[PDB]
């Protein structure tokens with residue numbers, strides 16, 4: 001609640017009004033890189049703890065993929081009050097992505113559309129960035145117990161998809177607390193192949209190193225990274241159940257629901273635009289998708305929420321629907337740096353008013 005946050009949020013609101021989106025994004029990533037952004041040093045409520053398997057989160061809010069694609073601003077973003085961040089999506093080789101401008105935002109609807117095109121510095125350089133962070137994390141009190149996942153994907157013109165992801169794992173898998181596979185860009189038999197192949201590569205990292213785990217997994221968990229998969233919402237009920245089966249057969253560690261959507265036409269400033277939409281308008285679509293997969297998987301696979309989360313209320317819908325954890329993106333654009341502090345406040349208070357003992361008790365409370 002400091003003036004630090006408050007003053008910065010004025011600057012951001014101003015930037016939001018006048019300056020191009022991707023230009024704004026990079027500007028504040030830069031400010032974070034030089035560590036002049038504010039901190040949230042509050043103790044988080046132990047009643048809003050959560051986990052995905054043996055992967056524990058000190059609080060249920062993190063940042064989604066695509067926000068810090070190259071892992072350049074990991075400390076500063078985590079210290080805003082987030083329990084974790086998902087970097088990437090990265091590819092084995094650097095990409096430029098599509099032509100600019102490629103990101104636009106509608107303020108009134110609190111929505112965004114993008115056709116970035118998986119721009120990133122490539123797996124090699126980003127791994128060097130994550131390593132440097134991991135080294136800083138050993139020295140910084142505030143980064144303890146904070147989780148860093150890595151989103152991985154295939155190059156535009158890939159020879160083979162699996163091989164792209166395989167390279168990324170070999171390079172960066174040691175520094176990741178979990179690995180996110182996203183097949184959501186704006187047959188199931190080919191998916192199962194991918195998922196398995198990823199678990200095997202991770203399992204191979206363990207086998208082919210002589211070191212014990214403490215000195216092998218240079219991450220937070222000190223164990224091999226979990227395997228999540230991120231799904232787009234533009235599928236039919238048949239696709240979803242077909243996939244739902246796969247995730248069970250592979251015994252995947254969690255699923256990130258969801259990515260952006262192409263099926264929104266009622267945003268006026270966006271009618272000229274191609275890409276995937278995110279923000280408020282994605283909220284209701286996203287939540288429904290969680291109920292479905294939660295049902296289709298019969299509640300065996302943990303879920304990670306993404307799509308139009310702005311408030312402690314929005315967060316609770318995802319949780320009761322079946323999510324264990326939430327990711328923010330659009331909220332930070334429209335609500336600023338206070339988003340983590342603010343949303344954690346709002347959620348803690350609601351859990352009380354809704355008579356919940358803790359957050360885990362509320363997970364999947366939509367029958």
Ligand SMILES: Cc1cc2nc3c(=O)[nH]c(=O)nc-3n(C[C@H](O)[C@H](O)[C@H](O)COP(=O)(O)O)c2cc1C
Pocket residue numbers: 064065066067069088089103112113114116118151182230258259260278279280282306307308309327328329330331
């Ligand atoms: C500019 C931009 C870039 C994104 N890049 C990625 C990405 O690289 N990988 C990914 O899985 N999701 C990416 N996303 C999607 C977000 O991770 C998130 O799923 C989506 O924005 C919905 O969250 P929200 O409604 O809170 O904004 C991107 C979104 C935006 C707006």
Ligand SMILES: Cc1cc(Nc2ccc(S(F)(F)(F)(F)F)cc2)n2nc(C(C)(F)F)nc2n1
Pocket residue numbers: 012013015016020021022023024025028029032037077080103104105112332333336337
């Ligand atoms: C004012 C503004 C800010 C912003 N992103 C953003 C906002 C805040 C921060 S941060 F991380 F201030 F501490 F929270 F630096 C980092 C990135 N974006 N991102 C975009 C976009 C949609 F182009 F990606 N437009 C923006 N406009």
Ligand SMILES: O=C(O)c1cc(=O)[nH]c(=O)[nH]1
Pocket residue numbers: 066089114115116117118119182184185186259260276
């Ligand atoms: O980089 C992108 O263009 C992108 C990737 C993704 O997974 N989702 C999205 O909305 N954009």
